[PDB]
């Protein structure tokens, strides 16, 4: 739970643009 550096505030941005 650190892929960018710890969630980019979000998750990866909002869960990576809502599941893509």
Not at 1 to 20: G, P, Q
């Amino acid at each position: 739970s650190d892929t960018r550096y710890n969630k980019d505030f979000i998750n990866n941005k909002h869960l990576n643009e809502h599941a893509h």
